[PDB]
Amino acid sequence: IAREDVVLNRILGEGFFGEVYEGVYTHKGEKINVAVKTCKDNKEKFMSEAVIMKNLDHPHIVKLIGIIEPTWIIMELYPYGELGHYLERNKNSLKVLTLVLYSLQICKAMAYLESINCVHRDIAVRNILVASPECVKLGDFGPIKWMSPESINFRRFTTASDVWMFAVCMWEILSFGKQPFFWLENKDVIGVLEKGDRLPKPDLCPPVLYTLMTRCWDYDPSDRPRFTELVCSLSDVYQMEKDIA
Numbered sequence: 670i671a672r673e674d675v676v677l678n679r680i681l682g683e684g685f686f687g688e689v690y691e692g693v694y695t696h697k698g699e700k701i702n703v704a705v706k707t708c709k710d711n712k713e714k715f716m717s718e719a720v721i722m723k724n725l726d727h728p729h730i731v732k733l734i735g736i737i738e739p740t741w742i743i744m745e746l747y748p749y750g751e752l753g754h755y756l757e758r759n760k761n762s763l764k765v766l767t768l769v770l771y772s773l774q775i776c777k778a779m780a781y782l783e784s785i786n787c788v789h790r791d792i793a794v795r796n797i798l799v800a801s802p803e804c805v806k807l808g809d810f811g812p813i814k815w816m817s818p819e820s821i822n823f824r825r826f827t828t829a830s831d832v833w834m835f836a837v838c839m840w841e842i843l844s845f846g847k848q849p850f851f852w853l854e855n856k857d858v859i860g861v862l863e864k865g866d867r868l869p870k871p872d873l874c875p876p877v878l879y880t881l882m883t884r885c886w887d888y889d890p891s892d893r894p895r896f897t898e899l900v901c902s903l904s905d906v907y908q909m910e911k912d913i914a
């Protein structure tokens with residue numbers, strides 16, 4: 670990938686390491702809309718996540734097109750934008766079926782990541798991209814109100830703590846993008862969790878799906894479902910909602 674093959678058109682916004690731009694990438698003459706991540710120990714880490722994304726090849730994880738070793742990461746651009754904002758715009762037209770579909774698609778992403786003990790740390794609707802109305806994609810690697818107790822208290826992140834956060838993300842999806850614990854300030858989140866209080870069931874969320882969510886919010890990380898079991902469960906929730914629809 671040569672920099673002459675990538676034209677920058679506009680700022681997309683501000684990423685962890687530097688600016689993100691949108692532009693177009695052109696070897697067969699096809700014009701491809703891309704997001705270009707840039708970088709102002711953090712350079713090497715910037716590169717590490719890029720190499721990881723280059724090796725990931727999954728339908729529900731954002732696609733890396735190439736890397737320009739001013740180091741640019743050329744990612745596929747999804748113009749629909751973040752899932753959170755997509756949900757709030759279309760909350761009156763979106764059906765429960767589709768919201769379970771989105772959760773299942775991210776869970777398939779996570780299940781793949783789990784199989785290589787790869788902890789993601791930012792499974793949140795703001796970090797999920799809408800590729801099409803029936804396809805969401807998990808964004809780049811990494812939020813007190815999304816984190817498990819053992820991450821808030823001990824800065825420990827495992828696949829089990831990703832499962833907790835995944836259930837927080839499902840809560841966000843079934844809530845059409847509300848922020849978890851928006852009635853709480855950060856300081857009293859862990860206190861609330863220590864007591865055994867959780868997020869309440871969203872109005873549109875089927876009870877079977879909320880039971881699954883509560884299992885992911887087990888204070889004990891060992892008791893939480895694995896992502897492989899969740900995919901089967903949600904596949905099961907999805908087929909049922911589809912039959913009702």
Ligand SMILES: CN(c1ncccc1CNc1nc(Nc2ccc3c(c2)CC(=O)N3)ncc1C(F)(F)F)S(C)(=O)=O
Nearest residue numbers: 681682683684689704731744745746747750751795796
């Ligand atoms: C805007 N930013 C993001 N916010 C949330 C998730 C992802 C990004 C940027 N990443 C991507 N962003 C997009 N598309 C996209 C997004 C957000 C909007 C738009 C398009 C239009 C818009 O108005 N907001 N497509 C692919 C990627 C990716 F991941 F593959 F590199 S930022 C804070 O500047 O980093």
